[PDB]
Design a protein around this motif. Structure first.
Motif, PDB file in Angstrom:
ATOM      1  N   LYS A 129       0.814  -1.205   0.000  1.00 59.75           N
ATOM      2  CA  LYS A 129       0.000   0.000   0.000  1.00 59.75           C
ATOM      3  C   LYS A 129       0.845   1.251   0.000  1.00 59.75           C
ATOM      4  CE  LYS A 129      -3.000  -0.150   3.121  1.00 59.75           C
ATOM      5  NZ  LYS A 129      -4.365  -0.255   3.701  1.00 59.75           N
ATOM      6  N   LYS A 130       1.976   1.217   0.705  1.00 65.71           N
ATOM      7  CA  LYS A 130       2.812   2.398   0.848  1.00 65.71           C
ATOM      8  C   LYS A 130       3.513   2.732  -0.458  1.00 65.71           C
ATOM      9  CE  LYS A 130       3.903   0.893   5.575  1.00 65.71           C
ATOM     10  NZ  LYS A 130       4.922  -0.068   6.087  1.00 65.71           N
ATOM     11  N   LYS A 131       3.688   1.746  -1.331  1.00 67.03           N
ATOM     12  CA  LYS A 131       4.375   1.978  -2.595  1.00 67.03           C
ATOM     13  C   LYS A 131       3.486   2.695  -3.605  1.00 67.03           C
ATOM     14  CE  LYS A 131       5.495  -0.735  -5.804  1.00 67.03           C
ATOM     15  NZ  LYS A 131       6.132  -1.565  -6.860  1.00 67.03           N
ATOM     16  N   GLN A 132       2.174   2.701  -3.370  1.00 64.52           N
ATOM     17  CA  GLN A 132       1.288   3.618  -4.062  1.00 64.52           C
ATOM     18  C   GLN A 132       1.164   4.941  -3.341  1.00 64.52           C
ATOM     19  OE1 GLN A 132      -2.311   0.841  -5.004  1.00 64.52           O
ATOM     20  NE2 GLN A 132      -1.797   0.621  -2.829  1.00 64.52           N
ATOM     21  N   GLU A 133       1.614   5.030  -2.093  1.00 59.99           N
ATOM     22  CA  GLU A 133       1.767   6.288  -1.381  1.00 59.99           C
ATOM     23  C   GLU A 133       3.203   6.786  -1.404  1.00 59.99           C
ATOM     24  OE1 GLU A 133      -1.503   7.508   1.385  1.00 59.99           O
ATOM     25  OE2 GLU A 133      -1.073   7.933  -0.705  1.00 59.99           O
ATOM     26  N   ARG A 134       4.091   6.055  -2.084  1.00 61.08           N
ATOM     27  CA  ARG A 134       5.469   6.471  -2.350  1.00 61.08           C
ATOM     28  C   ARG A 134       5.710   6.868  -3.792  1.00 61.08           C
ATOM     29  NH1 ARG A 134      10.247   4.769   1.517  1.00 61.08           N
ATOM     30  NH2 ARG A 134       9.044   6.433   2.547  1.00 61.08           N
ATOM     31  N   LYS A 135       5.035   6.275  -4.760  1.00 58.29           N
ATOM     32  CA  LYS A 135       5.198   6.702  -6.133  1.00 58.29           C
ATOM     33  C   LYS A 135       4.207   7.776  -6.522  1.00 58.29           C
ATOM     34  CE  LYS A 135       7.359   2.640  -8.315  1.00 58.29           C
ATOM     35  NZ  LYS A 135       7.851   2.112  -9.618  1.00 58.29           N
ATOM     36  N   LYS A 136       3.133   7.970  -5.760  1.00 62.78           N
ATOM     37  CA  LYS A 136       2.223   9.084  -6.009  1.00 62.78           C
ATOM     38  C   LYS A 136       2.716  10.339  -5.299  1.00 62.78           C
ATOM     39  CE  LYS A 136      -0.965   9.911  -3.385  1.00 62.78           C
ATOM     40  NZ  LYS A 136      -1.900   9.241  -2.463  1.00 62.78           N
ATOM     41  N   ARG A 137       3.271  10.161  -4.102  1.00 57.88           N
ATOM     42  CA  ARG A 137       3.969  11.202  -3.364  1.00 57.88           C
ATOM     43  C   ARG A 137       5.094  11.785  -4.197  1.00 57.88           C
ATOM     44  NH1 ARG A 137       5.954  12.967   1.861  1.00 57.88           N
ATOM     45  NH2 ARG A 137       3.774  12.394   2.329  1.00 57.88           N
ATOM     46  N   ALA A 138       5.842  10.915  -4.865  1.00 59.32           N
ATOM     47  CA  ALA A 138       7.009  11.318  -5.628  1.00 59.32           C
ATOM     48  C   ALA A 138       6.603  11.978  -6.928  1.00 59.32           C
ATOM     49  CB  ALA A 138       7.906  10.119  -5.914  1.00 59.32           C
ATOM     50  N   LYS A 139       5.344  11.816  -7.325  1.00 54.15           N
ATOM     51  CA  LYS A 139       4.840  12.513  -8.495  1.00 54.15           C
ATOM     52  C   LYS A 139       4.734  13.985  -8.186  1.00 54.15           C
ATOM     53  CE  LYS A 139       4.651   9.039 -11.098  1.00 54.15           C
ATOM     54  NZ  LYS A 139       3.529   9.074 -12.070  1.00 54.15           N
ATOM     55  N   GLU A 140       3.950  14.305  -7.167  1.00 54.03           N
ATOM     56  CA  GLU A 140       3.529  15.662  -6.859  1.00 54.03           C
ATOM     57  C   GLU A 140       4.683  16.559  -6.451  1.00 54.03           C
ATOM     58  OE1 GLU A 140       1.254  14.254  -3.773  1.00 54.03           O
ATOM     59  OE2 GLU A 140      -0.386  13.486  -5.016  1.00 54.03           O
ATOM     60  N   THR A 141       5.838  15.983  -6.140  1.00 52.56           N
ATOM     61  CA  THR A 141       7.014  16.808  -5.922  1.00 52.56           C
ATOM     62  C   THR A 141       7.951  16.864  -7.117  1.00 52.56           C
ATOM     63  OG1 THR A 141       8.458  17.457  -4.082  1.00 52.56           O
ATOM     64  CG2 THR A 141       8.788  15.249  -4.979  1.00 52.56           C
ATOM     65  N   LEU A 142       7.862  15.949  -8.085  1.00 49.69           N
ATOM     66  CA  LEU A 142       8.569  16.098  -9.350  1.00 49.69           C
ATOM     67  C   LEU A 142       7.753  16.876 -10.364  1.00 49.69           C
ATOM     68  CD1 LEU A 142      10.404  12.770 -10.031  1.00 49.69           C
ATOM     69  CD2 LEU A 142      11.232  14.813  -8.988  1.00 49.69           C
ATOM     70  N   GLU A 143       6.493  17.168 -10.043  1.00 48.41           N
ATOM     71  CA  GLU A 143       5.707  18.163 -10.746  1.00 48.41           C
ATOM     72  C   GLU A 143       5.989  19.566 -10.233  1.00 48.41           C
ATOM     73  OE1 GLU A 143       2.577  15.413 -12.836  1.00 48.41           O
ATOM     74  OE2 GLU A 143       3.488  17.367 -13.262  1.00 48.41           O
ATOM     75  N   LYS A 144       6.165  19.734  -8.923  1.00 48.93           N
ATOM     76  CA  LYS A 144       6.491  21.041  -8.347  1.00 48.93           C
ATOM     77  C   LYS A 144       7.982  21.268  -8.268  1.00 48.93           C
ATOM     78  CE  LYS A 144       4.831  20.371  -4.432  1.00 48.93           C
ATOM     79  NZ  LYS A 144       4.505  20.760  -3.035  1.00 48.93           N
ATOM     80  N   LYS A 145       8.776  20.403  -8.877  1.00 47.55           N
ATOM     81  CA  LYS A 145      10.182  20.690  -9.060  1.00 47.55           C
ATOM     82  C   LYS A 145      10.474  21.137 -10.470  1.00 47.55           C
ATOM     83  CE  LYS A 145      13.248  18.285  -6.008  1.00 47.55           C
ATOM     84  NZ  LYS A 145      13.731  16.937  -5.670  1.00 47.55           N
ATOM     85  N   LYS A 146       9.463  21.233 -11.329  1.00 47.71           N
ATOM     86  CA  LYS A 146       9.609  21.957 -12.581  1.00 47.71           C
ATOM     87  C   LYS A 146       8.942  23.323 -12.509  1.00 47.71           C
ATOM     88  CE  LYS A 146       6.795  19.241 -15.273  1.00 47.71           C
ATOM     89  NZ  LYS A 146       6.084  18.800 -14.055  1.00 47.71           N
ATOM     90  N   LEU A 147       7.942  23.486 -11.642  1.00 51.59           N
ATOM     91  CA  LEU A 147       7.330  24.792 -11.439  1.00 51.59           C
ATOM     92  C   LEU A 147       8.315  25.699 -10.727  1.00 51.59           C
ATOM     93  CD1 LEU A 147       3.818  23.839  -9.834  1.00 51.59           C
ATOM     94  CD2 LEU A 147       4.595  23.367 -12.213  1.00 51.59           C
ATOM     95  N   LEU A 148       9.227  25.123  -9.956  1.00 55.84           N
ATOM     96  CA  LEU A 148      10.236  25.935  -9.296  1.00 55.84           C
ATOM     97  C   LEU A 148      11.556  25.913 -10.066  1.00 55.84           C
ATOM     98  CD1 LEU A 148      10.160  26.538  -5.682  1.00 55.84           C
ATOM     99  CD2 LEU A 148      12.419  25.987  -6.525  1.00 55.84           C
ATOM    100  N   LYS A 149      11.684  25.046 -11.071  1.00 52.83           N
ATOM    101  CA  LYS A 149      12.865  25.064 -11.926  1.00 52.83           C
ATOM    102  C   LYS A 149      12.663  25.918 -13.171  1.00 52.83           C
ATOM    103  CE  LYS A 149      14.191  22.022 -14.976  1.00 52.83           C
ATOM    104  NZ  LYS A 149      14.349  21.915 -16.440  1.00 52.83           N
TER     105      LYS A 149
END
Ligand SMILES: [Mg+2]
Ligand SMILES: [Mg+2]
Ligand SMILES: [Mg+2]
Ligand SMILES: [Mg+2]
Ligand SMILES: [Mg+2]
Ligand SMILES: [Mg+2]
Ligand SMILES: [Mg+2]
Ligand SMILES: [Mg+2]
Ligand SMILES: [Mg+2]
Ligand SMILES: [Mg+2]
Ligand SMILES: [Mg+2]
Ligand SMILES: [Mg+2]
Ligand SMILES: [Mg+2]
Ligand SMILES: [Mg+2]
Ligand SMILES: [Mg+2]
Ligand SMILES: [Mg+2]
Ligand SMILES: [Mg+2]
Ligand SMILES: [Mg+2]
Ligand SMILES: [Mg+2]
Ligand SMILES: [Mg+2]
Ligand SMILES: [Mg+2]
Ligand SMILES: [Mg+2]
Ligand SMILES: [Mg+2]
Lengths: 205, 114, 157
Positions: B87-107
């Motif tokens: 279960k956590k691996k869907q809360e680890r790869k979805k978590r990692a989405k929303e910060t690699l989306e906001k690492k282009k808004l800040l890049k």
RNA sequence: CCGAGCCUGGUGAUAGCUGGUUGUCCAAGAUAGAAUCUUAGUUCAACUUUAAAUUUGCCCACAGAACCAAAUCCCCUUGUAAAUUUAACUGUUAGUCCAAAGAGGAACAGCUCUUUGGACACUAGGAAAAAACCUUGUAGAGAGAGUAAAAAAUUUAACACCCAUAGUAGGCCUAAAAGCAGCCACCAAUUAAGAAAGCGUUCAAGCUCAACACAAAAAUCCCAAACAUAUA
RNA sequence: GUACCCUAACCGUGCAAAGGUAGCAUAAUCACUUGUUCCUUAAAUAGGGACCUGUAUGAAUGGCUCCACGAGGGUUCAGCUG
RNA sequence: ACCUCGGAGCAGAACCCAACCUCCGAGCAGUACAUGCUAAGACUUCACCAGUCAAAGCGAACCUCAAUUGAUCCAAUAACUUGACCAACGGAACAAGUUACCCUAGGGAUAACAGCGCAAUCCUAUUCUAGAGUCCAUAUCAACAAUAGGGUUUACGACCUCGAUGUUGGAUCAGGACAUCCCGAUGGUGCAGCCGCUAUUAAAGGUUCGUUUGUUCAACGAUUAAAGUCCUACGUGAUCUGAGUUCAGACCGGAGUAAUCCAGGUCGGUUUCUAUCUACUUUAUUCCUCCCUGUACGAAAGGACAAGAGAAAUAAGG
RNA sequence: GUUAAUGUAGCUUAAAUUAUCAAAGCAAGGCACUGAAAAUGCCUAGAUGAGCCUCACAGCUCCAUUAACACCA
């Protein structure tokens, strides 16, 4: 409470310093609980040994099962297990300290009374179930009475004067006759040949 | 969610040599247990230690996971903590989405600064 | 090996030669010993009181009968004044000379029951007996006079 | 024949490690320890050997040696002839089993570790063969003698017969628990038979009793032969 | 640590330079391990396709498709043969 | 984990006394400030080094504490004095990993394989009757315990062998034990019959073929009268194999700064002998079909023995 | 398996004896009212059970908890 009470596996204060296997609490005649106090029937130890907690439930569960607790009663003449006996965790090489404390044990010498019985009954009511208790003990034991403990004492004292051998063990052992103390122990001056290790020989005058 | 126990009996423990992953110690050692269940068909081996006092007590710990699937099924404490800890691996790869989306808004806001 | 062992430890040979020399040797004699050289006293009053009192005594072989019918054979003489006594031959046989009964003595072997009274009915008792075709009446004694089963026909008719 | 060629030289490298170390005969001679990059070694002790010097050595008796078991220490007498000191050095300091007192382990080990003492690492006889158990140590020749230790004893399990009426299914609780689920009482009929000691009936029934009456099993093949009776 | 046809942290936080993305997946990938399942077999610890934390997968330590090729390493149909 | 020092036990009473034996401590502090100087005689940690006690005398006065520690050379300082968790504590002035690329010297003083010791573990038999078996301890099973025996396992030990005693499985040929899986005879049965359960006796003969896996095992398919349990250097490599393990190459996951490493995985990888000696080299079982008889047995379904006939199969000899 | 570490009010660290304030929650107290700034109290069996003294302290009885070694032939 006219029955044998429950005897626990370990002392309530657990012994925390380990002790040596002081095996001379098995060797020889007993000095405590050789005589009858409050009873008429008992189990004499004709040999030394260690009573684990399983023998204490061998004795208690098969005396409270075959006994009239209205008419007979019973009393422990050994304490609860106190002497800690270690065991090393299995598979190990020798050395590396002493082992951890595994369980406890009670030392019983020969001549000790182990379990005493009493009340209103003959010996033949009690000689039945006590002789089978005594055969499951780790030493040679025996149901005795008050009357048959002195009959085993006065007959063995008769065997000391009646015997026609000029040479007894106790005469040769103390006079050091053939240089015999080279072989004997220093306790055979006081055991006088009736004991050999934890075993007691009553056929020796 | 405890794992349902197993009796002291009904366990045909054989002791064979087994696989040998070593020079001469491991050809001659009957270290591998073959702790069986007599009711179900669940055969468990173990060469986890060079000692049966940890082989057999750990072979028992594996068997009480496999025969647990038999008497419970896919709703068991042996699949609960397979679907709870993945279960956590869907809360680890979805978590990692929303910060690699906001690492282009800040890049992209970086270096588009003048 | 330690001093106190689980198994009976072997001894040294000089020790084991000493535990053979100092064994117990019992006294043996010249010649073997064996080969050389209230309940009664009350019954020591009662049969003596049977023979002072009674007139006709009748003896028999009464072990022959059932638990009901021996109560009935008791009751078939209850209708008269005949009572029936049993006694131990270990205490009845020595009394007979103490009351001087020689011809009643070779008569008490096996189970034997006195059938005492003070007046005979035994004319009718043999008629009561005629339906149990066993249980035979032996020699009686009235006032120091024996009477056999023939003597209980010569008088009782 | 390359984790660094091959030859010559340094070079007779070094080896606390292995192996070897050659005439004859005799004598004295065996096991506390401590330090060590040391425990495969070495130095010092201890033991041992030779020479020298002197006088005590050993064995030991009373008395004596602490409070919180065996023994020893000390030690005149006595029985003995050895000891210390000095001089000069080598070697042995990788031990075993048995009896005893213990510790470790499993009151396992032909186990490991100390202690007292034997024996073995030396001879001969015995325990079958046999380092360590027992007998015996001081050397040669003998076709003499007396001995020492020195050879395992045991062989077990038969058993009563007869006979059984009765106050009552004692009361209790219980479906009913009747002699015998359970609690109290446990008297009593006759000459004598428990308010029942084991079975048995849901409960009963019934069958008896108490009673009067007269030690062994394992992997090539068992392992001297054999033997109860001639005087110690 | 609230997610219920086994399902919205739907919220609090610790620490870091950053917390593993796409892809692939019981692999030549610690163990469990003969994972679970379907095909293939009379029968499969083998093979192949899937699923899947894989708590020790993973992107030039290159990741994933794929054409040819290999005295590589496994599996197989038919044949064929001591 | 430990290494030096002290106290207690083992080590009971002069001294001494080991242990990867059992339990406590120590690496200071306090008070002096004659905690000045000298010197008979002793003690002594089994050596040495160090360490102790000390009358008298000189000068004055009217140490506590079990351990409480560190040599030499050197460095400091005018001198007196001072200097190490040199703690691996009798102390090298200053030095880690790694090796499967390995090397030499040795060792059975010391491990792995085998043997042997032992039997905790393991297996088995009796003993005891609690408990299950509707009732009933003993048809069957069996708790706590006890007594024995075995020598298959996993341990431990380190006695033979390191100037070599080569191994897992398989092949081949099997020798032996019996604690019997089948075939034989018997006792019990909670044995009607048929099947079974158990026990006594029996080692003459027999003890299958496959798929996966290196596998002995295990699972599975098919059978069987049955598909025994072990011992033989975990029988058998101077008869065989080499898949596994177990060298040099390499990949992956991991550990590591690295070299390299992992009881991981996975592909690959030389198996030598001409026989001197001993030894040796032509001594019937079973299943099925029929029958009896579908009888006996049983309420029925089911369903036997012994005797006899035939069919086959393996084994032996041709 | 074996040592080895760890535990804090409801929420994060403290504090080497004596237990804090920093947030949140009770409000009231400056301010027209909200915000701090204050001025309170507040909540820790210091994750256990025994007490050696007197102890989160210094250690087992402990419960869960994570790391790490279980090797060579
Ligand atoms: Mg040289
Ligand atoms: Mg050396
Ligand atoms: Mg050599
Ligand atoms: Mg000599
Ligand atoms: Mg003297
Ligand atoms: Mg030894
Ligand atoms: Mg001589
Ligand atoms: Mg009778
Ligand atoms: Mg090519
Ligand atoms: Mg000295
Ligand atoms: Mg002075
Ligand atoms: Mg050092
Ligand atoms: Mg040192
Ligand atoms: Mg390599
Ligand atoms: Mg050796
Ligand atoms: Mg071995
Ligand atoms: Mg040794
Ligand atoms: Mg070797
Ligand atoms: Mg050789
Ligand atoms: Mg047999
Ligand atoms: Mg072999
Ligand atoms: Mg060979
Ligand atoms: Mg190839």
């Amino acid at each position: 409470k006219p029955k044998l009470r429950f005897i626990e596996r370990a002392p309530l204060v657990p012994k925390v310093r380990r002790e040596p296997k002081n095996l001379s609490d098995i060797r020889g005649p007993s000095t405590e609980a050789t005589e009858f106090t409050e009873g008429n029937f008992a189990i004499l130890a004709l040999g030394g040994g260690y009573l684990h907690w399983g023998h204490f439930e061998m004795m208690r569960l098969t005396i409270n099962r075959s006994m009239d607790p209205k008419n007979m009663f019973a009393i422990w003449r050994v304490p609860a297990p106190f002497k800690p006996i270690t065991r090393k965790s299995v598979g190990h090489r020798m050395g590396g300290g002493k082992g951890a404390i595994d369980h406890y044990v009670t030392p019983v010498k020969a001549g000790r009374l182990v379990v005493e019985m009493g009340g209103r009954c003959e010996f033949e009511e009690v000689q039945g179930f006590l002789d089978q208790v005594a055969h499951k003990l780790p030493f040679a034991a025996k149901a005795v009475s008050r009357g048959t403990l002195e009959k085993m004492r006065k007959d063995q004292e008769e065997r000391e004067r009646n015997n026609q051998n000029p040479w007894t063990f106790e005469r040769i052992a103390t006079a050091n006759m053939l240089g015999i103390r080279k072989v004997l122990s220093p306790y055979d001056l006081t055991h006088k040949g009736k004991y050999w290790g934890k075993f007691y020989m009553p056929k020796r005058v | 969610p405890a794992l349902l126990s197993l009796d002291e009996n009904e366990l045909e423990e054989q002791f064979v040599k087994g696989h040998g992953p070593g020079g001469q110690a491991t050809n001659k050692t009957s270290n591998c247990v073959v702790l069986k269940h007599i009711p179900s068909g669940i055969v468990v081996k173990c060469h986890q230690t060079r000692s049966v006092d940890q082989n057999r007590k750990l072979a028992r710990k594996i068997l009480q996971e496999k025969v647990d699937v038999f008497y419970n099924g896919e709703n068991s404490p042996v699949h609960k903590e397979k679907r709870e800890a993945a279960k956590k691996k869907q809360e680890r790869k979805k978590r990692a989405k929303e910060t690699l989306e906001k690492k282009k808004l800040l890049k992209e806001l970086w270096e588009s600064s003048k | 090996s330690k001093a106190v062992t689980r198994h009976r430890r072997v001894m040294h040979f000089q020790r084991q030669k000493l535990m053979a020399v100092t064994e117990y040797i019992p006294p043996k004699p010249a010649i073997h010993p064996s080969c050389l050289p209230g309940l009664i006293r009350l019954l020591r009053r009662e049969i003596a009181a049977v023979f002072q009192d009674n007139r006709m005594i009748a003896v028999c072989q009464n072990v022959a009968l059932s638990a009901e019918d021996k109560l009935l054979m008791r009751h078939q003489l209850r209708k008269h004044k005949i009572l029936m006594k049993v006694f131990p031959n270990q205490v009845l046989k020595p009394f007979l000379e103490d009351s001087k009964y020689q011809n009643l003595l070779p008569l008490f072997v096996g189970h034997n029951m006195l059938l005492v009274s003070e007046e005979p009915k035994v004319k009718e008792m043999v008629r009561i007996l005629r339906t149990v075709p066993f249980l035979p009446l032996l020699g009686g004694c009235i006032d120091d006079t024996i009477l056999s089963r023939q003597g209980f026909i010569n008088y009782s008719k």
